[PDB]
Design an enzyme around this catalytic site. Structure first.
Site, short mmCIF file in Angstrom:
data_model
loop_
_atom_site.label_atom_id
_atom_site.label_comp_id
_atom_site.label_asym_id
_atom_site.label_seq_id
_atom_site.Cartn_x
_atom_site.Cartn_y
_atom_site.Cartn_z
N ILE A 71 0.81 -1.20 0.00
CA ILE A 71 0.00 0.00 0.00
C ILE A 71 0.86 1.26 0.00
O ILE A 71 1.66 1.47 0.90
CB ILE A 71 -0.88 0.07 1.26
CG1 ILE A 71 -2.04 -0.94 1.15
CG2 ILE A 71 -1.45 1.47 1.45
CD1 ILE A 71 -2.81 -1.16 2.43
N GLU A 160 -2.38 -8.73 3.30
CA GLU A 160 -1.95 -9.98 3.87
C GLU A 160 -2.96 -11.10 3.63
O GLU A 160 -2.59 -12.17 3.35
CB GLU A 160 -1.57 -9.85 5.35
CG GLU A 160 -0.51 -8.80 5.60
CD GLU A 160 0.90 -9.20 5.22
OE1 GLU A 160 1.06 -10.15 4.47
OE2 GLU A 160 1.84 -8.53 5.68
N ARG A 163 -2.55 -12.39 0.17
CA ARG A 163 -1.38 -13.26 0.03
C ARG A 163 -1.54 -14.67 0.59
O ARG A 163 -0.90 -15.60 0.09
CB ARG A 163 -0.17 -12.62 0.70
CG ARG A 163 0.31 -11.36 0.02
CD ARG A 163 1.25 -10.64 0.96
NE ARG A 163 1.83 -9.43 0.37
CZ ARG A 163 2.23 -8.38 1.08
NH1 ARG A 163 2.08 -8.37 2.40
NH2 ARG A 163 2.75 -7.32 0.46
#
Ligand code: NAG
Ligand code: ARG
Length: 246
Positions: A71, A160, A163
């Site tokens: 980000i 996260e 991912r």
């Protein structure tokens, strides 16, 4: 662009958002069936915009670098905010240019600096969909200390989760009640670069990691990942950081 609304959000709609976020990231290859993020992308195409709406329908737009899911900055009403980082400075040349003003935050976007700014490690910050709603609300009006904590929440509930399927599931479990991340969650966050690398190195090493990756499992036990048959590779990780960026 991808969008997520906290108004009426549930584990299903959050799951759809994370799927959209993953699918918005370009790739030309898969490595062991996991999308491999690009080495680089030039110009404005490097950045994905995520539109996030809090429960009251107020919105921020978050700019994400599609090569690493980092980000870079965000837009709240007519003000843009960017991390104090060369990569975010570059992003500011392409996104949110119509903002009336641009504020550079007094920290970079890495976990260590954010935790210092927030005054606490993320082991102690509850995450979940209510925390995300709070984070969006916090970012609407500038306050750099509060924003550091909000950004830690934002990073973990979006990037996260994109991912790692385990992290997405942890957030789904926290749809209506925040809770600090599991030790396993923190371990995975800390290991994404390492895992991405070893999975790529395994391609010419018969599926075997050149260097074992140490992780904490759901039970709280420390475990070694040595090859691509591990559940973390076959089920969990959803995006690989290109080794050219490691
Ligand atoms: C590879 O990892 C699997 C799954 O953890 C493990 O059971 C096995 O011992 C490892 N095998 C090799 C050849 O490294
Ligand atoms: N996974 C993420 N979305 N991380 C956000 C942090 C971005 C920031 N530019 C950095 O240095 O990492």
């Amino acid at each position: 662009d991808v969008s997520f609304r906290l108004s009426g959000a549930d584990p299903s709609s959050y799951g759809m958002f994370i799927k959209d976020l993953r699918n918005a990231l370009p790739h030309t290859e898969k490595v062991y069936n996991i999308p491999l993020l690009l080495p680089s992308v030039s110009g404005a195409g490097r950045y994905l915009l995520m539109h996030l709406f809090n429960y009251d329908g107020n919105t921020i737009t978050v700019a994400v670098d599609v090569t690493n899911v980092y980000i870079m900055g965000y837009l709240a009403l007519t003000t843009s905010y960017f991390f104090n980082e060369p990569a975010a400075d570059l992003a500011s040349q392409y996104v949110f240019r119509s903002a009336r003003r641009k504020i550079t935050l007094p920290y970079s976007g890495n976990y260590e600096r954010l935790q210092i700014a927030a005054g606490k490690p993320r082991e102690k910050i509850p995450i979940g969909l209510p925390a995300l709603d709070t984070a969006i609300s916090t970012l609407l009006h500038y306050d750099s200390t509060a924003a550091a904590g909000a950004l830690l929440v934002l990073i973990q509930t979006t990037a996260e989760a994109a991912r790692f399927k385990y992290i997405e599931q942890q957030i789904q479990e926290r749809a209506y009640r925040d809770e600090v991340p599991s030790s396993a969650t923190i371990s995975l966050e800390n290991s994404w670069s390492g895992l991405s690398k070893q999975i790529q190195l395994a391609q010419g090493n018969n599926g075997v990691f050149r260097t074992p990756t140490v992780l904490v499992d759901s039970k709280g036990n420390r475990v070694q990942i040595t090859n691509v048959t591990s559940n973390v590779v076959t089920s969990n990780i959803q995006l690989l950081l290109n080794t050219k960026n490691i």
